C-alpha cells in the first residue's frame, strides 16, 4: 500500500460512519503527472481507536480491492498510519446508492435500475472469474460516479466499494443485524464465507435497488431475523417486481444452487 504523509491530508466534514469507522471528506496535496502539484478530493476512512485491534482486517478489505484493476471497483489512493489507521480512497461525487435511491426514488425507472444491476453484475463477474470474495455487497457499498443523462443518452455509472471489516471476525450481534445481506450459511458459521455469499448478497442488493432505498427486514429485530432464516422465508417482492424472480433465485438457501454471474448477466440482458 502506498504510504501518504499525514502532512499532505486535510480532514474536512464528516460524512457518516461505517462498522467501527468514521468517514470524512478531505483533500490530498500531491505531485501528479508531469510534476504538477494537485489538490485532490479524497474519501478518508478512519478506524476507531477503541477498535484498533481490527486494523489488519480493516486494511485487508481495502487490499482486496487494490490487487485487481477494474473500471467498476473503487480506487484506493493509499494508507496513512500517528495513532490513526486511515484509508485514503477516491472521492465519488454522488455518494452511496442507498441514499441516492431514497432521495431520487420518484424518478428512477426500470431502465436505470437495469443498467445499475448490469454494471454491478459485471463487477461481481470480474471478481468471480478471479475467485476473489467481496463479502459485503450492499447498496451502501455502491457508489454513483455519474448520474444518468437522458439528454445525451449517458447511462449512470457505478463502482463497488470495499467490504469493510470482514464478517469472519465481526461480533455475532453485528452479523445478525446484517441479515438478510449475510447469507444463512454465514450466520450458521461466518467461516463459510465463499463465492456464493456474494451471489446471495447481490440478490439482497437488487431488492434494495428495487425498493427505493428501503432496508429489507428492518422492522425485525435480530432474534426475528434469525427466525426468518430458520423458517426459510424469502424476501417479499418489491412493488416494482421486475427483478423479483432474479432476487429469489440469487437468495437460494442452498449455496451450490445460486446461479453464476454469467447466468445472472444473461437474465438481466434477457429482461
Ligand atoms: N450524500 S452526500 O452528498 O453528502 C455525499 C456523500 C459521499 C460522497 N462521496 C463518497 N462516499 C463514499 O461513501 C458513501 C457514504 C460514506 C459514509 C456515509 C455517507 C456516504 C465513498 N467511498 C469511497 N469513495 C466515496 N465517496 C459524495 C456525496
Amino acid at each position: 500500500f502506498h504510504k501518504i504523509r499525514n502532512e499532505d491530508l486535510i480532514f474536512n466534514e464528516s460524512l457518516g460512519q461505517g462498522t467501527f469507522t468514521k468517514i470524512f471528506k478531505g483533500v490530498r496535496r500531491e505531485v501528479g503527472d508531469y510534476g504538477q502539484l494537485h489538490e485532490t478530493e479524497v474519501l478518508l476512512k478512519v478506524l476507531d481507536k477503541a477498535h484498533r485491534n481490527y486494523s489488519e482486517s480493516f486494511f485487508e478489505a481495502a487490499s482486496m480491492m487494490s490487487k485487481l484493476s477494474h473500471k467498476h471497483l473503487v480506487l484506493n489512493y493509499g494508507v496513512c498510519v500517528g495513532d490513526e489507521n486511515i484509508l485514503v480512497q477516491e472521492f465519488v461525487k454522488f455518494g452511496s446508492l442507498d441514499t441516492y435511491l431514497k432521495k431520487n426514488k420518484n424518478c428512477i425507472n426500470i431502465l436505470w435500475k437495469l443498467e445499475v444491476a448490469k454494471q454491478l453484475a459485471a463487477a461481481m463477474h470480474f471478481l468471480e472469474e478471479n475467485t476473489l470474495i467481496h463479502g459485503n455487497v450492499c447498496a451502501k457499498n455502491i457508489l454513483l460516479i455519474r448520474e444518468e443523462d437522458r439528454k445525451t443518452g449517458n447511462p449512470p455509472f457505478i463502482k463497488l466499494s470495499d467490504p469493510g471489516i470482514s464478517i469472519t471476525v465481526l461480533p455475532k450481534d453485528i452479523l445478525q443485524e446484517r441479515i438478510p445481506w449475510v447469507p444463512p450459511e454465514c450466520i450458521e458459521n461466518p467461516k463459510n464465507l465463499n463465492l456464493a455469499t456474494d451471489k446471495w448478497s447481490f440478490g439482497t442488493t437488487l431488492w434494495e435497488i428495487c425498493s427505493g432505498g428501503d432496508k429489507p427486514l428492518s422492522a425485525l429485530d435480530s432474534q426475528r431475523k434469525l427466525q426468518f432464516y430458520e423458517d426459510r422465508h424469502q424476501l417479499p417482492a418489491p412493488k416494482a417486481a421486475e427483478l423479483a424472480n432474479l432476487i429469489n433465485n440469487c437468495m437460494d438457501y442452498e449455496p451450490d444452487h445460486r446461479p453464476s454471474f454469467r447466468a445472472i448477466i444473461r437474465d438481466l440482458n434477457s429482461l
Side-chain angles (χ1 to χ4, degrees), residues 1-2 4-6 8-21 23-28 30-35 37-48 50-51 53-55 57-59 61-66 68-101 104-105 107-139 141-149 152-171 173-190 192-222 224-238 240-261 263-265 267-271:
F1 252 147
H2 171 81
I4 301 182
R5 295 196 302 120
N6 167 274
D8 296 333
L9 297 172
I10 302 179
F11 279 75
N12 288 320
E13 69 255 44
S14 173
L15 298 171
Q17 330 168 22
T19 300
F20 302 154
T21 67
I23 314 305
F24 298 83
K25 183 178 181 179
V27 164
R28 176 191 183 184
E30 53 181 328
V31 180
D33 302 331
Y34 311 99
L37 284 166
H38 293 115
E39 207 97 343
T40 304
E41 290 180 324
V42 293
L43 195 284
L44 302 161
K45 298 185 169 165
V46 181
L47 183 61
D48 291 333
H51 303 101
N53 61 289
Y54 286 95
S55 61
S57 191
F58 171 77
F59 287 118
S63 187
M64 87 124 284
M65 305 289 293
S66 287
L68 302 176
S69 187
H70 192 271
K71 67 179 178 184
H72 281 310
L73 300 175
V74 65
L75 295 173
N76 291 325
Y77 293 157
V79 293
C80 187
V81 287
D83 65 333
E84 308 246 56
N85 299 111
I86 300 169
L87 175 67
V88 188
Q89 303 185 315
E90 66 173 307
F91 186 76
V92 175
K93 180 169 183 180
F94 296 100
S96 59
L97 202 66
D98 54 323
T99 296
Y100 190 87
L101 293 160
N104 301 277
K105 175 165 49 181
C107 62
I108 286 181
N109 62 4
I110 176 60
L111 295 168
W112 188 99
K113 298 165 44 179
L114 224 48
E115 181 69 37
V116 167
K118 287 177 185 175
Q119 296 181 24
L120 173 62
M124 301 311 300
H125 175 68
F126 177 78
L127 292 178
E128 186 186 34
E129 297 279 276
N130 286 271
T131 70
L132 193 51
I133 305 169
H134 186 269
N136 195 12
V137 182
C138 54
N141 286 331
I142 305 180
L143 319 170
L144 187 62
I145 295 284
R146 73 161 192 262
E147 303 187 277
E148 173 178 65
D149 186 357
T152 187
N154 274 345
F157 195 94
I158 59 102
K159 283 190 176 189
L160 179 60
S161 196
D162 72 286
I165 302 178
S166 176
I167 56 174
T168 63
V169 303
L170 283 176
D173 49 308
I174 298 181
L175 245 60
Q176 295 178 3
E177 290 181 12
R178 289 191 179 185
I179 293 176
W181 291 271
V182 172
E185 69 269 15
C186 290
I187 293 301
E188 164 190 3
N189 191 340
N192 284 337
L193 189 63
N194 193 265
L195 290 175
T197 292
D198 287 337
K199 297 168 173 61
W200 176 286
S201 302
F202 172 88
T204 306
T205 305
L206 284 189
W207 193 97
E208 280 182 285
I209 287 170
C210 293
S211 295
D214 296 351
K215 295 305 183 293
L217 309 182
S218 63
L220 300 187
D221 72 336
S222 284
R224 284 170 172 168
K225 300 186 176 188
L226 276 176
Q227 192 60 32
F228 180 94
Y229 273 179
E230 288 289 319
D231 299 317
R232 302 248 169 168
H233 289 305
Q234 306 285 342
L235 290 183
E242 286 84 2
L243 302 177
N245 289 329
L246 179 60
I247 291 167
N248 289 345
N249 287 336
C250 292
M251 302 180 71
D252 199 316
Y253 278 84
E254 179 51 61
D256 289 351
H257 297 177
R258 294 165 195 167
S260 76
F261 273 103
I264 291 171
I265 290 174
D267 267 328
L268 290 173
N269 293 331
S270 83
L271 287 170

